[PDB]
Amino acid sequence: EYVQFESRSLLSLFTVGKIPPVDAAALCYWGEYDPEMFDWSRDYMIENIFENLPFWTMIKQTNWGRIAIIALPRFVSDLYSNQDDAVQVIIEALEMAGIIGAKFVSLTGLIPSATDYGLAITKAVANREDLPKITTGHRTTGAAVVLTIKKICEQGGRDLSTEKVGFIGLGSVGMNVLPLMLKCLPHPQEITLCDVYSKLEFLENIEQNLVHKFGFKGKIKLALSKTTVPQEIYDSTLIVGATNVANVLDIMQVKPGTLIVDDSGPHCFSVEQAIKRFQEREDILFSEGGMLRSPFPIKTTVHLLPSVEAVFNSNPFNIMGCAFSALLSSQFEQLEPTVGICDGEQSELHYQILQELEFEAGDLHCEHYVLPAKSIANFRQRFGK
Amino acid sequence: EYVQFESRSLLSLFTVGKIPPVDAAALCYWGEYDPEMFDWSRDYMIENIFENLPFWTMIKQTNWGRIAIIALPRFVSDLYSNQDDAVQVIIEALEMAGIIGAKFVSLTGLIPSATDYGLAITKAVANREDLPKITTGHRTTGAAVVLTIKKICEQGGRDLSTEKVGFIGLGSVGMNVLPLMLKCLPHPQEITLCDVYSKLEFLENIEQNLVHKFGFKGKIKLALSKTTVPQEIYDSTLIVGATNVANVLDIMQVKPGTLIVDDSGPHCFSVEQAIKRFQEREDILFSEGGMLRSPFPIKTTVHLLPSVAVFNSNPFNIMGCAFSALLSSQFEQLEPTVGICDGEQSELHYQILQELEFEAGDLHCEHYVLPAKSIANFRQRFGK
Numbered sequence: 038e039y040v041q042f043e044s045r046s047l048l049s050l051f052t053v054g055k056i057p058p059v060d061a062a063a064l065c066y067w068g069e070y071d072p073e074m075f076d077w078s079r080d081y082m083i084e085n086i087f088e089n090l091p092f093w094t095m096i097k098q099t100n101w102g103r104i105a106i107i108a109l110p111r112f113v114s115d116l117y118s119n120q121d122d123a124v125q126v127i128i129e130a131l132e133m134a135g136i137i138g139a140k141f142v143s144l145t146g147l148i149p150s151a152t153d154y155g156l157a158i159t160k161a162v163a164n165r166e167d168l169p170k171i172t173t174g175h176r177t178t179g180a181a182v183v184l185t186i187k188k189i190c191e192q193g194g195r196d197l198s199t200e201k202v203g204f205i206g207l208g209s210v211g212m213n214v215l216p217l218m219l220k221c222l223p224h225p226q227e228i229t230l231c232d233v234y235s236k237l238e239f240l241e242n243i244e245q246n247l248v249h250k251f252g253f254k255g256k257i258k259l260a261l262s263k264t265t266v267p268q269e270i271y272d273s274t275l276i277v278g279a280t281n282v283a284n285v286l287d288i289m290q291v292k293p294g295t296l297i298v299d300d301s302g303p304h305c306f307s308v309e310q311a312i313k314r315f316q317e318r319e320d321i322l323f324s325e326g327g328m329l330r331s332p333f334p335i336k337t338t339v340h341l342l343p344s345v346e347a348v349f350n351s352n353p354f355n356i357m358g359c360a361f362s363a364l365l366s367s368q369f370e371q372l373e374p375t376v377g378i379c380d381g382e383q384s385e386l387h388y389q390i391l392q393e394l395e396f397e398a399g400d401l402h403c404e405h406y407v408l409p410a411k412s413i414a415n416f417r418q419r420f421g422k
Numbered sequence: 423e424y425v426q427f428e429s430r431s432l433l434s435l436f437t438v439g440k441i442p443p444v445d446a447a448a449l450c451y452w453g454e455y456d457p458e459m460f461d462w463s464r465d466y467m468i469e470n471i472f473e474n475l476p477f478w479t480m481i482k483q484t485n486w487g488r489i490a491i492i493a494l495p496r497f498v499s500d501l502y503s504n505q506d507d508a509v510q511v512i513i514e515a516l517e518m519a520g521i522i523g524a525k526f527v528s529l530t531g532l533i534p535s536a537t538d539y540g541l542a543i544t545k546a547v548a549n550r551e552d553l554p555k556i557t558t559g560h561r562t563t564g565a566a567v568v569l570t571i572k573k574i575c576e577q578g579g580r581d582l583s584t585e586k587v588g589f590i591g592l593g594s595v596g597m598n599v600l601p602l603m604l605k606c607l608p609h610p611q612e613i614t615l616c617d618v619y620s621k622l623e624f625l626e627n628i629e630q631n632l633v634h635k636f637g638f639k640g641k642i643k644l645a646l647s648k649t650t651v652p653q654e655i656y657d658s659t660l661i662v663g664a665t666n667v668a669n670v671l672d673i674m675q676v677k678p679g680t681l682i683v684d685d686s687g688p689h690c691f692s693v694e695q696a697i698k699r700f701q702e703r704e705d706i707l708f709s710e711g712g713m714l715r716s717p718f719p720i721k722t723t724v725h726l727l728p729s730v731a732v733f734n735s736n737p738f739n740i741m742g743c744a745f746s747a748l749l750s751s752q753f754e755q756l757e758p759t760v761g762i763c764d765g766e767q768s769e770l771h772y773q774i775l776q777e778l779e780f781e782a783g784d785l786h787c788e789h790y791v792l793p794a795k796s797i798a799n800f801r802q803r804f805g806k
């Protein structure tokens with residue numbers, strides 16, 4: 038009904054006028070390469086499975102316009118292993134996106150982290166005016182995470198003002214969330230900042246800004262990670278994750294009653310262990326942080342790659358925040374696209390427009406698993422006020 | 423080499439900038455469907471193999487620009503039985519062609535014959551301004567045939583002024599050839615006009631134009647067909663075919679020393695029997711008529727449809743009416759042709775081709791090339 042499978046090439050159908058142009062696009066990639074998960078080398082898959090070409094795989098038709106989902110013919114390790122190659126395949130994808138009508142293109146996942154947050158792309162296309170504008174979409178991602186913090190506190194039966202909040206990963210997304218949360222929601226009583234040892238000075242500057250720029254009056258703690266989070270993080274009652282490193286948090290050690298919002302992909306904790314613990318004990322709440330719930334249902338068209346071949350039954354109201362960011366920039370000129378580490382209060386404009394449009398966070402879920410509403414109510418009966 | 427196989431979609435490669443745009447396109451179709459498919463239905467091919475989409479299958483890189491070859495997702499019988507659908511899929515292919523750069527698009531094969539010579543396409547594109555221009559390319563086809571007539575007489579040791587010429591099929595292509603032949607080459611001794619019985623009045627008018635308009639002083643004979651060609655046609659020593667019906671001419675009945683230039687597709691005689699007879703007796707010269715020979719080798723990129731001869735192709739050869747779309751984009755005086763146009767711009771095409779050092783392709787029929795030594799034997803037994 039809201040999900041339609043298309044066996045024919047979306048690009049071919051577009052070029053003969055059988056499907057309309059899109060207004061925006063979002064670039065993704067094929068996860069991570071593991072030699073024990075595939076029959077062939079990395080180079081074989083890139084050349085023969087992905088054909089070294091970007092692949093237009095989905096259309097998301099929202100009330101605010103159409104988004105093409107385009108997959109780069111690369112794994113995440115390829116983006117980091119050669120930034121020049123990453124930029125060149127992204128430029129090939131931007132040329133395709135422009136032909137099919139995109140005006141703005143979102144860089145999802147770790148594409149910003151691997152490309153100087155878009156700046157390496159913008160410099161390589163500065164001499165071109167025929168390509169769509171790029172955005173990391175991270176201000177909208179930041180607002181989706183704050184909306185999820187709001188929702189998981191509501192579903193948990195608690196107020197944020199009583200929480201001890203631990204931030205795991207204070208990179209581009211993480212530092213969009215922390216100031217916006219302080220702007221939009223009641224201040225918690227304690228904030229822990231957790232990142233790797235080499236970012237201690239960076240974290241100490243964040244602590245200064247918490248006191249003197251963002252008006253935070255509660256307790257502040259710094260927690261340095263090595264291969265995993267230090268044990269102090271398990272003192273937090275709300276954990277907010279935005280790491281580029283999987284499984285740094287042991288979900289079996291969070292205390293009963295803990296709320297977890299995580300935009301990390303893969304998650305900073307084990308999804309299968311979190312689900313098992315929730316099914317057995319119903320004593321945590323956990324969710325993706327970057328997903329928005331549109332007030333109107335979204336029509337999704339899906340064209341699977343035959344060689345690469347949870348789509349059906351997927352929630353038709355849900356859309357990823359940074360993907361939707363590209364439509365926000367075309368609909369509302371004030372919501373300018375973002376490249377580089379962008380510091381400022383413009384995230385509040387993303388939060389305000391999302392609320393005026395009656396977006397909220399997606400219902401609590403983690404990859405394939407939706408937390409059933411009765412189990413959430415059981416958690417709330419035991420661990421709320 | 424000059425032929426390059428590409429396993430990836432040309433359309434995909436173009437949209438990422440790995441293939442440059444083209445200057446023109448030519449539409450074709452997937453031959454004829456019949457129980458020769460032995461394993462798959464017609465609707466299964468159209469719905470699941472062609473996917474009801476045009477298929478960009480080749481690029482030809484010439485010294486005068488690039489042309490995309492695009493196959494319509496239909497068989498030839500589908501074009502005649504349903505002119506409405508044929509126009510609809512052609513307009514879909516024109517939108518793709520415009521996206522990949524084509525300014526002019528040729529309609530090859532029987533597409534003009536089944537679409538009122540492009541008039542039906544022009545009608546349905548109405549006021550749309552986002553599509554490339556179409557052309558039948560038949561004025562360039564006519565120039566290729568006249569160039570082949572010139573070439574087969576060169577190599578046969580014969581001169582046209584002493585020949586008895588029989589035209590089989592006087593449609594769009596055939597009537598581009600005849601006036602142009604009279605204008606560019608020495609007038610033959612005799613001309614026979616052969617078409618279907620229902621076109622008698624049309625042929626009678628051609629005869630009046632031959633004498634009073636084109637200044638032909640030789641003998642003119644009309645000889646209609648009811649199914650196969652009448653016996654009068656076998657009195658001809660040069661036969662020029664352009665029918666939309668196959669196997670109306672019996673190659674076994676032609677006299678020794680007969681020259682045959684055929685643009686029919688499939689041919690109006692049996693290709694198998696023509697080869698067999700030529701090998702055993704070497705008493706006929708026969709060739710395609712619509713094939714041009716470029717002075718420079720053409721580089722071809724081929725993307726074969728994954729479901730469904732090319733490397734054995736002459737890299738100098740290019741089909742006349744395909745090339746016509748490139749001529750229209752290069753030379754603004756060679757206007758595109760839609761409908762039965764007649765006219766005498768045909769000389770311009772012929773003159774431009776000679777200017778560019780084009781000639782007819784070497785004598786060949788489909789996959790078979792007539793060996794140059796067997797051509798010399800013919801010239802000994804039947805030339806001068």
Ligand SMILES: *SCCNC(=O)CCNC(=O)[C@H](O)C(C)(C)COP(=O)(O)OP(=O)(O)OC[C@H]1O[C@@H](n2cnc3c(N)ncnc32)[C@H](O)[C@@H]1O
Nearest residue numbers: 145146147150206208209210232262280281282301302359
């Ligand atoms: S489009 C919306 C973006 N989100 C998604 O697409 C879903 C998940 N996909 C991802 O690619 C990533 O998980 C993120 C995008 C969420 C990473 O975000 P980003 O902010 O762009 O990446 P960045 O490299 O700038 O910061 C990452 C952050 O994580 C810290 N970190 C690494 N290891 C640790 C440990 N062990 N503890 C704590 N922090 C850690 C990095 O040092 C860095 O600051």
Ligand SMILES: *SCCNC(=O)CCNC(=O)[C@H](O)C(C)(C)COP(=O)(O)OP(=O)(O)OC[C@H]1O[C@@H](n2cnc3c(N)ncnc32)[C@H](O)[C@@H]1O
Nearest residue numbers: 531532535591593594595617647665666667670686687743
């Ligand atoms: S790129 C240039 C186009 N040529 C080709 O692509 C190669 C061959 N492909 C074909 O589709 C056809 O063979 C032609 C294009 C050569 C057909 O020519 P055209 O002029 O466009 O078609 P039209 O229908 O206008 O005329 C055909 C002609 O043949 C007559 N005819 C039919 N049956 C007979 C018989 N038995 N005898 C004599 N003539 C016959 C038709 O009445 C009709 O007038």
